[PDB]
Amino acid sequence: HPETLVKVKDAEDQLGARVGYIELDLNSGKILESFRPEERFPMMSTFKVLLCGAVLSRVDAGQEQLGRRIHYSQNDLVEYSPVTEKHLTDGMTVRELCSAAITMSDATAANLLLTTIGGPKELTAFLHNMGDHVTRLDRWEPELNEAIPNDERDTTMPAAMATTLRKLLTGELLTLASRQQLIDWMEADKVAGPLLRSALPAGWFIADKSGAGERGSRGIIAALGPDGKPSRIVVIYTTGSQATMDERNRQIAEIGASLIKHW
Ligand SMILES: *C(=O)[C@H]([C@@H](C)O)[C@H]1CC(SCCNC=N)=C(C(=O)O)N1
Ligand SMILES: [K+]
Ligand SMILES: [K+]
Ligand SMILES: [K+]
Ligand SMILES: [K+]
């Protein structure tokens, strides 16, 4: 609904920065509403969903096991590793790492998982192979969050990310067991509460992944819908703002409040 575009452009104004937005019908793939849908924005942590999608594709192909245990050390820990920092002694399994990477947005977990698939080049090759010729991961945590103006490294476009999430959550790309596992990790959450979830009505479903990087970058990707089932995909990214995290979170929550109201 155009009233949501009023809020999205108001958010750009309030934040003094670019906001990218897209609302997609999950079943049909139809773009219902958009703003700067084909401009690039840093993915930040939202890439972790794509990463675990690739991991699950490997699991399906018999090239990985969710129960495989990965051992790491203090040497491996990067900034923001709330879960991995507690398991240095006995390690964590692949399943546990994706749960950490998605529900807590653990950065070290993402790096360990990236290593299992062959690094950024392989995640990018996975995306290209699934029809996403835009989204690219080029670096590891923490550098991938640099958000350098006009830099195409580690970026996606709202339309591309929305289309990719749709394929991951509904396409024959993954087995049903794997699709649901990805959805289960996205439904769980300990960090995106101030975002779309703060505007979600009781009874509604939401599977999401947020992100925050340098230079004011902030974003979220999500599949949500009434009556416990997802029916639309929403992608929101912003970069360039000097606003506080609370201010950026509120704008994303208000964009969510609008799209829900006009559903
Ligand atoms: C992803 O965008 C980053 C990166 C460090 O992996 C992480 C860190 C953060 S902000 C720290 C805690 N978040 C919220 N309480 C996020 C994030 O999305 O908020 N992901
Ligand atoms: K429209
Ligand atoms: K555009
Ligand atoms: K160790
Ligand atoms: K989540």
Ligand SMILES: [K+]
């Ligand atoms: K949210």
